[PDB]
Amino acid sequence: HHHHHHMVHITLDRNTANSWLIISKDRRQVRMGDTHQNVSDNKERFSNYPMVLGAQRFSSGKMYWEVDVTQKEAWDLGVCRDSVQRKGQFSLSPENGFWTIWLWQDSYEAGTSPQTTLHIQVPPCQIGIFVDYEAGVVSFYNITDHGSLIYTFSECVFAGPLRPFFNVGFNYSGGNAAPLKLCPL
Ligand SMILES: CC(=O)N[C@H]1CNc2ccccc2C1
């Protein structure tokens, strides 16, 4: 792809994080802790899942960023509405304000309702995310496989400001402790 020139510097918003998450001092990395991280509860924190939002809000333009997923077994990535539900159980779908892909149990799927199978020959170590607000497009790229397209959500109805969206996943296996990292420009 040729989206690299729309690169934006994303930082994570501590106040939105599930209380188990550890965000690095530079606000560029997040991982699962082995316990509650000794923060107060608030209405913004994701309660049920190890999720966090980026601080940046997008309402126009073209935006691109990259995330490192090396050696993780499970994760969700993409964008969401600023007003997505934070508490209780919910599915990742455009109807609920999320435009995401994920890895789970050795298969990759797009967060449509119902979910769509992805066809990935080279397991990605880094994912590129491209948003065109005006066009209503969210696209995902395999940086490990020379930038090959993973999935395009088109005809998106954002219906609000967008935030970068992250889920580090559960670590019940002991094989998913690795962080999500925002990669340098
Ligand atoms: C080993 C592991 O993944 N433990 C879960 C427990 N439960 C839980 C609930 C919300 C957010 C994160 C978590 C972590």
PDB file of N, CA and C in Angstrom, residues 83-180:
ATOM      1  N   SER A  83     -18.081   6.553  21.922  1.00  0.00           N
ATOM      2  CA  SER A  83     -19.169   6.255  22.875  1.00  0.00           C
ATOM      3  C   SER A  83     -19.495   4.767  23.017  1.00  0.00           C
ATOM      4  N   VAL A  84     -18.601   3.871  22.574  1.00  0.00           N
ATOM      5  CA  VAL A  84     -18.867   2.425  22.793  1.00  0.00           C
ATOM      6  C   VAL A  84     -19.098   2.141  24.286  1.00  0.00           C
ATOM      7  N   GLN A  85     -19.947   1.153  24.524  1.00  0.00           N
ATOM      8  CA  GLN A  85     -20.199   0.556  25.868  1.00  0.00           C
ATOM      9  C   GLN A  85     -18.859   0.127  26.481  1.00  0.00           C
ATOM     10  N   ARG A  86     -18.697   0.366  27.767  1.00  0.00           N
ATOM     11  CA  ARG A  86     -17.460   0.031  28.518  1.00  0.00           C
ATOM     12  C   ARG A  86     -17.728  -1.136  29.483  1.00  0.00           C
ATOM     13  N   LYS A  87     -18.935  -1.263  30.016  1.00  0.00           N
ATOM     14  CA  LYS A  87     -19.241  -2.200  31.120  1.00  0.00           C
ATOM     15  C   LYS A  87     -20.031  -3.382  30.610  1.00  0.00           C
ATOM     16  N   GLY A  88     -19.794  -4.550  31.176  1.00  0.00           N
ATOM     17  CA  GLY A  88     -20.549  -5.762  30.833  1.00  0.00           C
ATOM     18  C   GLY A  88     -20.096  -6.445  29.561  1.00  0.00           C
ATOM     19  N   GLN A  89     -20.917  -7.381  29.081  1.00  0.00           N
ATOM     20  CA  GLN A  89     -20.587  -8.234  27.922  1.00  0.00           C
ATOM     21  C   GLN A  89     -21.103  -7.571  26.651  1.00  0.00           C
ATOM     22  N   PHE A  90     -20.328  -7.656  25.568  1.00  0.00           N
ATOM     23  CA  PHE A  90     -20.728  -7.147  24.237  1.00  0.00           C
ATOM     24  C   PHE A  90     -19.868  -7.813  23.165  1.00  0.00           C
ATOM     25  N   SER A  91     -20.388  -7.871  21.941  1.00  0.00           N
ATOM     26  CA  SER A  91     -19.634  -8.352  20.758  1.00  0.00           C
ATOM     27  C   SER A  91     -18.994  -7.156  20.054  1.00  0.00           C
ATOM     28  N   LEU A  92     -17.864  -7.436  19.404  1.00  0.00           N
ATOM     29  CA  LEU A  92     -17.188  -6.457  18.537  1.00  0.00           C
ATOM     30  C   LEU A  92     -17.851  -6.526  17.162  1.00  0.00           C
ATOM     31  N   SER A  93     -18.641  -5.516  16.787  1.00  0.00           N
ATOM     32  CA  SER A  93     -19.390  -5.462  15.520  1.00  0.00           C
ATOM     33  C   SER A  93     -19.574  -4.005  15.153  1.00  0.00           C
ATOM     34  N   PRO A  94     -19.764  -3.695  13.878  1.00  0.00           N
ATOM     35  CA  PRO A  94     -20.079  -2.321  13.506  1.00  0.00           C
ATOM     36  C   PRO A  94     -21.387  -1.827  14.131  1.00  0.00           C
ATOM     37  N   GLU A  95     -22.359  -2.723  14.352  1.00  0.00           N
ATOM     38  CA  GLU A  95     -23.634  -2.337  15.033  1.00  0.00           C
ATOM     39  C   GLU A  95     -23.346  -1.801  16.433  1.00  0.00           C
ATOM     40  N   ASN A  96     -22.323  -2.317  17.131  1.00  0.00           N
ATOM     41  CA  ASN A  96     -21.943  -1.838  18.478  1.00  0.00           C
ATOM     42  C   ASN A  96     -20.832  -0.783  18.423  1.00  0.00           C
ATOM     43  N   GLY A  97     -20.450  -0.270  17.249  1.00  0.00           N
ATOM     44  CA  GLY A  97     -19.458   0.807  17.143  1.00  0.00           C
ATOM     45  C   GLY A  97     -18.011   0.373  17.050  1.00  0.00           C
ATOM     46  N   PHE A  98     -17.733  -0.843  16.553  1.00  0.00           N
ATOM     47  CA  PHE A  98     -16.334  -1.357  16.452  1.00  0.00           C
ATOM     48  C   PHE A  98     -16.017  -1.829  15.026  1.00  0.00           C
ATOM     49  N   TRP A  99     -14.837  -1.474  14.530  1.00  0.00           N
ATOM     50  CA  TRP A  99     -14.285  -1.928  13.221  1.00  0.00           C
ATOM     51  C   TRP A  99     -12.932  -2.566  13.506  1.00  0.00           C
ATOM     52  N   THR A 100     -12.939  -3.914  13.639  1.00  0.00           N
ATOM     53  CA  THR A 100     -11.798  -4.642  14.245  1.00  0.00           C
ATOM     54  C   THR A 100     -11.530  -5.947  13.473  1.00  0.00           C
ATOM     55  N   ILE A 101     -10.322  -6.444  13.666  1.00  0.00           N
ATOM     56  CA  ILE A 101      -9.947  -7.847  13.324  1.00  0.00           C
ATOM     57  C   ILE A 101      -9.350  -8.447  14.603  1.00  0.00           C
ATOM     58  N   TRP A 102      -9.215  -9.762  14.576  1.00  0.00           N
ATOM     59  CA  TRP A 102      -8.638 -10.457  15.733  1.00  0.00           C
ATOM     60  C   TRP A 102      -7.980 -11.756  15.361  1.00  0.00           C
ATOM     61  N   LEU A 103      -7.115 -12.187  16.307  1.00  0.00           N
ATOM     62  CA  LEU A 103      -6.527 -13.536  16.342  1.00  0.00           C
ATOM     63  C   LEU A 103      -7.111 -14.287  17.531  1.00  0.00           C
ATOM     64  N   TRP A 104      -7.524 -15.538  17.322  1.00  0.00           N
ATOM     65  CA  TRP A 104      -8.097 -16.385  18.374  1.00  0.00           C
ATOM     66  C   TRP A 104      -7.946 -17.834  17.938  1.00  0.00           C
ATOM     67  N   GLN A 105      -7.299 -18.656  18.784  1.00  0.00           N
ATOM     68  CA  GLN A 105      -7.218 -20.116  18.506  1.00  0.00           C
ATOM     69  C   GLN A 105      -6.707 -20.357  17.103  1.00  0.00           C
ATOM     70  N   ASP A 106      -5.598 -19.724  16.759  1.00  0.00           N
ATOM     71  CA  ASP A 106      -4.851 -20.006  15.514  1.00  0.00           C
ATOM     72  C   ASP A 106      -5.630 -19.590  14.255  1.00  0.00           C
ATOM     73  N   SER A 107      -6.724 -18.844  14.365  1.00  0.00           N
ATOM     74  CA  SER A 107      -7.399 -18.299  13.156  1.00  0.00           C
ATOM     75  C   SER A 107      -7.635 -16.791  13.295  1.00  0.00           C
ATOM     76  N   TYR A 108      -7.591 -16.118  12.169  1.00  0.00           N
ATOM     77  CA  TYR A 108      -7.807 -14.651  12.085  1.00  0.00           C
ATOM     78  C   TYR A 108      -9.203 -14.388  11.531  1.00  0.00           C
ATOM     79  N   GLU A 109      -9.936 -13.442  12.126  1.00  0.00           N
ATOM     80  CA  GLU A 109     -11.319 -13.124  11.675  1.00  0.00           C
ATOM     81  C   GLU A 109     -11.587 -11.624  11.768  1.00  0.00           C
ATOM     82  N   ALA A 110     -12.389 -11.114  10.835  1.00  0.00           N
ATOM     83  CA  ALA A 110     -12.879  -9.733  10.895  1.00  0.00           C
ATOM     84  C   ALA A 110     -14.140  -9.692  11.731  1.00  0.00           C
ATOM     85  N   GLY A 111     -14.237  -8.646  12.573  1.00  0.00           N
ATOM     86  CA  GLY A 111     -15.355  -8.378  13.496  1.00  0.00           C
ATOM     87  C   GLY A 111     -16.606  -7.870  12.818  1.00  0.00           C
ATOM     88  N   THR A 112     -17.074  -8.535  11.780  1.00  0.00           N
ATOM     89  CA  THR A 112     -18.434  -8.383  11.258  1.00  0.00           C
ATOM     90  C   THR A 112     -19.409  -9.204  12.119  1.00  0.00           C
ATOM     91  N   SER A 113     -20.724  -9.053  11.884  1.00  0.00           N
ATOM     92  CA  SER A 113     -21.766  -9.856  12.543  1.00  0.00           C
ATOM     93  C   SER A 113     -22.578 -10.600  11.482  1.00  0.00           C
ATOM     94  N   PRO A 114     -22.363 -11.916  11.319  1.00  0.00           N
ATOM     95  CA  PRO A 114     -21.393 -12.685  12.088  1.00  0.00           C
ATOM     96  C   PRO A 114     -19.971 -12.505  11.526  1.00  0.00           C
ATOM     97  N   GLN A 115     -18.976 -12.992  12.250  1.00  0.00           N
ATOM     98  CA  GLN A 115     -17.550 -12.747  11.945  1.00  0.00           C
ATOM     99  C   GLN A 115     -17.171 -13.394  10.603  1.00  0.00           C
ATOM    100  N   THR A 116     -16.173 -12.814   9.944  1.00  0.00           N
ATOM    101  CA  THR A 116     -15.697 -13.231   8.621  1.00  0.00           C
ATOM    102  C   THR A 116     -14.311 -13.860   8.751  1.00  0.00           C
ATOM    103  N   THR A 117     -14.125 -15.039   8.159  1.00  0.00           N
ATOM    104  CA  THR A 117     -12.808 -15.682   8.047  1.00  0.00           C
ATOM    105  C   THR A 117     -11.815 -14.870   7.233  1.00  0.00           C
ATOM    106  N   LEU A 118     -10.595 -14.688   7.729  1.00  0.00           N
ATOM    107  CA  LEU A 118      -9.506 -13.997   7.019  1.00  0.00           C
ATOM    108  C   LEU A 118      -8.598 -15.088   6.437  1.00  0.00           C
ATOM    109  N   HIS A 119      -7.903 -14.769   5.366  1.00  0.00           N
ATOM    110  CA  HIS A 119      -7.015 -15.721   4.648  1.00  0.00           C
ATOM    111  C   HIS A 119      -5.604 -15.180   4.765  1.00  0.00           C
ATOM    112  N   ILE A 120      -4.858 -15.619   5.756  1.00  0.00           N
ATOM    113  CA  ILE A 120      -3.483 -15.132   6.013  1.00  0.00           C
ATOM    114  C   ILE A 120      -2.496 -16.313   5.876  1.00  0.00           C
ATOM    115  N   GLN A 121      -1.595 -16.228   4.909  1.00  0.00           N
ATOM    116  CA  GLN A 121      -0.575 -17.284   4.657  1.00  0.00           C
ATOM    117  C   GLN A 121       0.665 -17.024   5.531  1.00  0.00           C
ATOM    118  N   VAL A 122       0.980 -15.759   5.796  1.00  0.00           N
ATOM    119  CA  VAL A 122       2.162 -15.350   6.614  1.00  0.00           C
ATOM    120  C   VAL A 122       1.678 -14.731   7.924  1.00  0.00           C
ATOM    121  N   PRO A 123       1.713 -15.438   9.075  1.00  0.00           N
ATOM    122  CA  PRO A 123       1.216 -14.856  10.334  1.00  0.00           C
ATOM    123  C   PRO A 123       1.882 -13.515  10.578  1.00  0.00           C
ATOM    124  N   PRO A 124       1.120 -12.410  10.751  1.00  0.00           N
ATOM    125  CA  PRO A 124       1.719 -11.098  10.917  1.00  0.00           C
ATOM    126  C   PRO A 124       2.390 -10.925  12.293  1.00  0.00           C
ATOM    127  N   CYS A 125       3.541 -10.291  12.306  1.00  0.00           N
ATOM    128  CA  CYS A 125       4.187  -9.757  13.536  1.00  0.00           C
ATOM    129  C   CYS A 125       3.826  -8.278  13.734  1.00  0.00           C
ATOM    130  N   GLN A 126       3.460  -7.559  12.666  1.00  0.00           N
ATOM    131  CA  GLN A 126       2.982  -6.150  12.772  1.00  0.00           C
ATOM    132  C   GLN A 126       1.815  -5.951  11.799  1.00  0.00           C
ATOM    133  N   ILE A 127       0.820  -5.180  12.253  1.00  0.00           N
ATOM    134  CA  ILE A 127      -0.466  -4.912  11.544  1.00  0.00           C
ATOM    135  C   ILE A 127      -0.463  -3.404  11.267  1.00  0.00           C
ATOM    136  N   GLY A 128      -0.777  -3.007  10.038  1.00  0.00           N
ATOM    137  CA  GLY A 128      -1.047  -1.600   9.715  1.00  0.00           C
ATOM    138  C   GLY A 128      -2.542  -1.360   9.611  1.00  0.00           C
ATOM    139  N   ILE A 129      -2.988  -0.260  10.219  1.00  0.00           N
ATOM    140  CA  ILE A 129      -4.423   0.155  10.256  1.00  0.00           C
ATOM    141  C   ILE A 129      -4.577   1.506   9.568  1.00  0.00           C
ATOM    142  N   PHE A 130      -5.439   1.532   8.576  1.00  0.00           N
ATOM    143  CA  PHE A 130      -5.716   2.740   7.764  1.00  0.00           C
ATOM    144  C   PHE A 130      -7.188   3.093   7.915  1.00  0.00           C
ATOM    145  N   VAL A 131      -7.463   4.358   8.272  1.00  0.00           N
ATOM    146  CA  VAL A 131      -8.841   4.885   8.360  1.00  0.00           C
ATOM    147  C   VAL A 131      -8.989   6.073   7.407  1.00  0.00           C
ATOM    148  N   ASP A 132      -9.994   6.020   6.539  1.00  0.00           N
ATOM    149  CA  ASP A 132     -10.434   7.199   5.729  1.00  0.00           C
ATOM    150  C   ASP A 132     -11.817   7.580   6.224  1.00  0.00           C
ATOM    151  N   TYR A 133     -11.881   8.656   7.029  1.00  0.00           N
ATOM    152  CA  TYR A 133     -13.128   9.041   7.695  1.00  0.00           C
ATOM    153  C   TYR A 133     -14.205   9.402   6.656  1.00  0.00           C
ATOM    154  N   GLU A 134     -13.833  10.227   5.697  1.00  0.00           N
ATOM    155  CA  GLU A 134     -14.830  10.732   4.719  1.00  0.00           C
ATOM    156  C   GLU A 134     -15.323   9.580   3.862  1.00  0.00           C
ATOM    157  N   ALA A 135     -14.443   8.690   3.425  1.00  0.00           N
ATOM    158  CA  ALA A 135     -14.830   7.578   2.550  1.00  0.00           C
ATOM    159  C   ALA A 135     -15.597   6.488   3.308  1.00  0.00           C
ATOM    160  N   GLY A 136     -15.492   6.423   4.640  1.00  0.00           N
ATOM    161  CA  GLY A 136     -16.111   5.341   5.402  1.00  0.00           C
ATOM    162  C   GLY A 136     -15.363   4.016   5.210  1.00  0.00           C
ATOM    163  N   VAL A 137     -14.047   4.035   5.381  1.00  0.00           N
ATOM    164  CA  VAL A 137     -13.138   2.868   5.119  1.00  0.00           C
ATOM    165  C   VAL A 137     -12.236   2.634   6.324  1.00  0.00           C
ATOM    166  N   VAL A 138     -12.153   1.365   6.734  1.00  0.00           N
ATOM    167  CA  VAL A 138     -11.109   0.892   7.668  1.00  0.00           C
ATOM    168  C   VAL A 138     -10.399  -0.317   7.025  1.00  0.00           C
ATOM    169  N   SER A 139      -9.096  -0.215   6.813  1.00  0.00           N
ATOM    170  CA  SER A 139      -8.349  -1.310   6.160  1.00  0.00           C
ATOM    171  C   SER A 139      -7.205  -1.766   7.061  1.00  0.00           C
ATOM    172  N   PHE A 140      -6.879  -3.044   6.939  1.00  0.00           N
ATOM    173  CA  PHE A 140      -5.833  -3.729   7.737  1.00  0.00           C
ATOM    174  C   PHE A 140      -4.832  -4.342   6.768  1.00  0.00           C
ATOM    175  N   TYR A 141      -3.558  -4.191   7.117  1.00  0.00           N
ATOM    176  CA  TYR A 141      -2.419  -4.616   6.263  1.00  0.00           C
ATOM    177  C   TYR A 141      -1.445  -5.485   7.063  1.00  0.00           C
ATOM    178  N   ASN A 142      -0.898  -6.484   6.375  1.00  0.00           N
ATOM    179  CA  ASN A 142       0.095  -7.444   6.948  1.00  0.00           C
ATOM    180  C   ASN A 142       1.500  -6.882   6.670  1.00  0.00           C
ATOM    181  N   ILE A 143       2.132  -6.229   7.644  1.00  0.00           N
ATOM    182  CA  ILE A 143       3.425  -5.547   7.436  1.00  0.00           C
ATOM    183  C   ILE A 143       4.499  -6.633   7.229  1.00  0.00           C
ATOM    184  N   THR A 144       4.351  -7.785   7.855  1.00  0.00           N
ATOM    185  CA  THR A 144       5.347  -8.905   7.731  1.00  0.00           C
ATOM    186  C   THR A 144       5.364  -9.416   6.287  1.00  0.00           C
ATOM    187  N   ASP A 145       4.224  -9.396   5.599  1.00  0.00           N
ATOM    188  CA  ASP A 145       4.066  -9.880   4.192  1.00  0.00           C
ATOM    189  C   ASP A 145       4.020  -8.688   3.223  1.00  0.00           C
ATOM    190  N   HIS A 146       4.984  -7.784   3.314  1.00  0.00           N
ATOM    191  CA  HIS A 146       5.177  -6.647   2.379  1.00  0.00           C
ATOM    192  C   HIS A 146       3.876  -5.840   2.268  1.00  0.00           C
ATOM    193  N   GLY A 147       3.100  -5.732   3.344  1.00  0.00           N
ATOM    194  CA  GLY A 147       1.980  -4.775   3.319  1.00  0.00           C
ATOM    195  C   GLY A 147       0.733  -5.325   2.662  1.00  0.00           C
ATOM    196  N   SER A 148       0.607  -6.626   2.505  1.00  0.00           N
ATOM    197  CA  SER A 148      -0.533  -7.254   1.795  1.00  0.00           C
ATOM    198  C   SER A 148      -1.846  -6.949   2.531  1.00  0.00           C
ATOM    199  N   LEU A 149      -2.913  -6.751   1.789  1.00  0.00           N
ATOM    200  CA  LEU A 149      -4.232  -6.481   2.403  1.00  0.00           C
ATOM    201  C   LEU A 149      -4.737  -7.692   3.154  1.00  0.00           C
ATOM    202  N   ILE A 150      -5.191  -7.443   4.375  1.00  0.00           N
ATOM    203  CA  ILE A 150      -5.905  -8.407   5.213  1.00  0.00           C
ATOM    204  C   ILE A 150      -7.419  -8.263   5.032  1.00  0.00           C
ATOM    205  N   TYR A 151      -7.927  -7.045   5.242  1.00  0.00           N
ATOM    206  CA  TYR A 151      -9.405  -6.860   5.253  1.00  0.00           C
ATOM    207  C   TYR A 151      -9.722  -5.365   5.099  1.00  0.00           C
ATOM    208  N   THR A 152     -10.798  -5.076   4.352  1.00  0.00           N
ATOM    209  CA  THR A 152     -11.370  -3.718   4.197  1.00  0.00           C
ATOM    210  C   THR A 152     -12.814  -3.754   4.634  1.00  0.00           C
ATOM    211  N   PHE A 153     -13.130  -2.951   5.666  1.00  0.00           N
ATOM    212  CA  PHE A 153     -14.526  -2.538   5.988  1.00  0.00           C
ATOM    213  C   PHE A 153     -14.842  -1.302   5.121  1.00  0.00           C
ATOM    214  N   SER A 154     -15.849  -1.419   4.256  1.00  0.00           N
ATOM    215  CA  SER A 154     -16.287  -0.259   3.459  1.00  0.00           C
ATOM    216  C   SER A 154     -17.747   0.044   3.796  1.00  0.00           C
ATOM    217  N   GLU A 155     -18.197   1.223   3.349  1.00  0.00           N
ATOM    218  CA  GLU A 155     -19.569   1.704   3.662  1.00  0.00           C
ATOM    219  C   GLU A 155     -19.738   1.789   5.186  1.00  0.00           C
ATOM    220  N   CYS A 156     -18.672   2.172   5.872  1.00  0.00           N
ATOM    221  CA  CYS A 156     -18.737   2.270   7.355  1.00  0.00           C
ATOM    222  C   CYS A 156     -19.630   3.458   7.766  1.00  0.00           C
ATOM    223  N   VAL A 157     -20.461   3.248   8.777  1.00  0.00           N
ATOM    224  CA  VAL A 157     -21.274   4.352   9.333  1.00  0.00           C
ATOM    225  C   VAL A 157     -20.688   4.661  10.719  1.00  0.00           C
ATOM    226  N   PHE A 158     -19.650   5.483  10.793  1.00  0.00           N
ATOM    227  CA  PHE A 158     -18.927   5.747  12.062  1.00  0.00           C
ATOM    228  C   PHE A 158     -19.852   6.366  13.107  1.00  0.00           C
ATOM    229  N   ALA A 159     -20.633   7.353  12.707  1.00  0.00           N
ATOM    230  CA  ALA A 159     -21.673   7.985  13.545  1.00  0.00           C
ATOM    231  C   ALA A 159     -21.090   8.654  14.800  1.00  0.00           C
ATOM    232  N   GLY A 160     -19.847   9.083  14.752  1.00  0.00           N
ATOM    233  CA  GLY A 160     -19.202   9.784  15.875  1.00  0.00           C
ATOM    234  C   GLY A 160     -17.712   9.880  15.676  1.00  0.00           C
ATOM    235  N   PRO A 161     -16.998  10.505  16.607  1.00  0.00           N
ATOM    236  CA  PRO A 161     -15.545  10.493  16.616  1.00  0.00           C
ATOM    237  C   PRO A 161     -15.042   9.054  16.813  1.00  0.00           C
ATOM    238  N   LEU A 162     -13.897   8.773  16.207  1.00  0.00           N
ATOM    239  CA  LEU A 162     -13.246   7.435  16.301  1.00  0.00           C
ATOM    240  C   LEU A 162     -12.043   7.494  17.225  1.00  0.00           C
ATOM    241  N   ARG A 163     -11.823   6.398  17.942  1.00  0.00           N
ATOM    242  CA  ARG A 163     -10.592   6.194  18.729  1.00  0.00           C
ATOM    243  C   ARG A 163      -9.897   4.890  18.338  1.00  0.00           C
ATOM    244  N   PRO A 164      -8.554   4.865  18.370  1.00  0.00           N
ATOM    245  CA  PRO A 164      -7.835   3.591  18.201  1.00  0.00           C
ATOM    246  C   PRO A 164      -8.272   2.634  19.330  1.00  0.00           C
ATOM    247  N   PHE A 165      -8.413   1.354  19.002  1.00  0.00           N
ATOM    248  CA  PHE A 165      -8.959   0.318  19.895  1.00  0.00           C
ATOM    249  C   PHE A 165      -7.971  -0.848  19.976  1.00  0.00           C
ATOM    250  N   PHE A 166      -7.790  -1.383  21.199  1.00  0.00           N
ATOM    251  CA  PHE A 166      -6.815  -2.447  21.518  1.00  0.00           C
ATOM    252  C   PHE A 166      -7.439  -3.446  22.473  1.00  0.00           C
ATOM    253  N   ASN A 167      -7.164  -4.720  22.270  1.00  0.00           N
ATOM    254  CA  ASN A 167      -7.430  -5.779  23.284  1.00  0.00           C
ATOM    255  C   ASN A 167      -6.193  -6.659  23.313  1.00  0.00           C
ATOM    256  N   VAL A 168      -5.495  -6.730  24.464  1.00  0.00           N
ATOM    257  CA  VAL A 168      -4.280  -7.580  24.577  1.00  0.00           C
ATOM    258  C   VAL A 168      -4.665  -9.069  24.698  1.00  0.00           C
ATOM    259  N   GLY A 169      -5.938  -9.345  24.944  1.00  0.00           N
ATOM    260  CA  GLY A 169      -6.415 -10.715  25.185  1.00  0.00           C
ATOM    261  C   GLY A 169      -6.105 -11.248  26.557  1.00  0.00           C
ATOM    262  N   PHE A 170      -6.830 -12.314  26.906  1.00  0.00           N
ATOM    263  CA  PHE A 170      -6.677 -13.096  28.159  1.00  0.00           C
ATOM    264  C   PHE A 170      -5.387 -13.920  28.093  1.00  0.00           C
ATOM    265  N   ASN A 171      -4.834 -14.276  29.258  1.00  0.00           N
ATOM    266  CA  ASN A 171      -3.609 -15.104  29.299  1.00  0.00           C
ATOM    267  C   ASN A 171      -3.851 -16.339  30.171  1.00  0.00           C
ATOM    268  N   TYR A 172      -4.932 -17.074  29.918  1.00  0.00           N
ATOM    269  CA  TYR A 172      -5.247 -18.334  30.652  1.00  0.00           C
ATOM    270  C   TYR A 172      -4.260 -19.445  30.275  1.00  0.00           C
ATOM    271  N   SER A 173      -3.610 -19.346  29.112  1.00  0.00           N
ATOM    272  CA  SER A 173      -2.679 -20.385  28.605  1.00  0.00           C
ATOM    273  C   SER A 173      -1.261 -20.189  29.120  1.00  0.00           C
ATOM    274  N   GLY A 174      -0.921 -18.996  29.587  1.00  0.00           N
ATOM    275  CA  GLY A 174       0.482 -18.673  29.877  1.00  0.00           C
ATOM    276  C   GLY A 174       1.294 -18.402  28.623  1.00  0.00           C
ATOM    277  N   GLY A 175       0.690 -18.431  27.439  1.00  0.00           N
ATOM    278  CA  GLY A 175       1.393 -18.157  26.172  1.00  0.00           C
ATOM    279  C   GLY A 175       1.012 -16.818  25.544  1.00  0.00           C
ATOM    280  N   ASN A 176       0.230 -15.973  26.223  1.00  0.00           N
ATOM    281  CA  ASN A 176      -0.210 -14.696  25.623  1.00  0.00           C
ATOM    282  C   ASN A 176       0.178 -13.475  26.461  1.00  0.00           C
ATOM    283  N   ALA A 177       1.282 -13.522  27.188  1.00  0.00           N
ATOM    284  CA  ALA A 177       1.716 -12.393  28.055  1.00  0.00           C
ATOM    285  C   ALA A 177       2.308 -11.236  27.253  1.00  0.00           C
ATOM    286  N   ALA A 178       2.776 -11.490  26.026  1.00  0.00           N
ATOM    287  CA  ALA A 178       3.500 -10.450  25.270  1.00  0.00           C
ATOM    288  C   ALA A 178       2.642  -9.194  25.110  1.00  0.00           C
ATOM    289  N   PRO A 179       3.287  -8.017  25.023  1.00  0.00           N
ATOM    290  CA  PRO A 179       2.560  -6.763  24.827  1.00  0.00           C
ATOM    291  C   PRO A 179       2.066  -6.510  23.383  1.00  0.00           C
ATOM    292  N   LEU A 180       1.104  -5.593  23.247  1.00  0.00           N
ATOM    293  CA  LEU A 180       0.863  -4.817  22.015  1.00  0.00           C
ATOM    294  C   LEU A 180       1.789  -3.601  22.076  1.00  0.00           C
TER     295      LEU A 180
END
